[PDB]
Amino acid sequence: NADAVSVAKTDIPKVLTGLFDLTQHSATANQRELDLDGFKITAKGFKSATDSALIAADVNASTAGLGVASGNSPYHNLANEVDFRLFDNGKSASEELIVKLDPGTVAYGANIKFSQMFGGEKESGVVEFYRGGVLISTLTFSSDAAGGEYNQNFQVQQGGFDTMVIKATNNGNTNISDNSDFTVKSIEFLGTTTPQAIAYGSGTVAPQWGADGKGHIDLLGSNEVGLMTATGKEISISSKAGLPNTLYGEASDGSLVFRLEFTPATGKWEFFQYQNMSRPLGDGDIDFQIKVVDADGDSSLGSFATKPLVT
Ligand SMILES: [Ca+2]
Ligand SMILES: [Ca+2]
Ligand SMILES: [Ca+2]
Ligand SMILES: [Ca+2]
Ligand SMILES: [Ca+2]
Secondary structure, three states, rough: OOOOOOOOOOOOEEOEEEEEOOOOOOOOOOOOEEEOOEEEEEEEEEOOOOOOOOOEEEEEEEEEEOOOOOOOOOOOOOEEEEOOEEEHHHHHHHHOOOOEEOEEEEOOOOEEEEEEEOOOOEEEEEEEEOOEEEEEEEEEEEEOOOOOOOOEOOOOOOEEEEEEEEEOOOOOOOOOOOOOOEEEEEEEEOOOOOOOOEEEEEOOOOOOOOOOOOOEEEEEEEEOOOOOOOOOEEEEEEEEEEEEEEEEEEOOOOOEEEEEEEEEOOOOOOOOOOEEEOOOOOOOOOOEEEEEEEOOOOOEEEEEEEOEEEO
């Protein structure tokens, strides 16, 4: 149960999509900041050979991809690779790559490909996705997949993020080699290429959990039929198989009228309009449905609404 919030023509997030080939920067070996179109890339590295504290490091660009260049590590200090190392004071830490999108930009999916990490020695790591400084999604990966020509590192779970942290995790070993061999080869920001958004609406499903705590929120879809563009064409809401967090509103000429993007971890929902609509039947809002599952599994059905742009 949630009241409609009108969409608006201002402060619309720029949506970032497209595949970015991170092997095309080797001309400058070492930058503190890589600057591509829509995002920047930084790096955090070890404070010394015997200090696991993270400090600003250089992004190291090569024909294989990007890695982090710590001045010193306790062993196997690789310049072109993101490294997890143990330190003899008895604690461990990983180098970091940081993908930071430009202000007012968001992605709803990522497909990340690494290099220098398959072919024998166990290699593992994790990608964290943040939106506004909340954790939104993690993706863990490992050279137990099926070779350097194997993606499956997908994240259309949660939609919105503005920040990726890519780091290594512990592979199990002790002092010669650990998770190192891991170099970011490409990053593809998922989503269909749309027109230019003429309106935007955002709210957050925040519901009563009770005393048994939080579990998860789910995007049911949308009941709405009879929705029409202001030119009078019928609208058909739909998902792709396996991707409950993106509803497309298409117009029966095939064109996109709106998209809804949902972020389950925070409950955030974001409405993008591309064509003016006719006043939605009955109420005047587009009603989407949610199921608020529990830590047990104790369920509760509700809804969030938004009034679209209507000439
Ligand atoms: Ca390194
Ligand atoms: Ca290694
Ligand atoms: Ca309603
Ligand atoms: Ca409605
Ligand atoms: Ca309960």
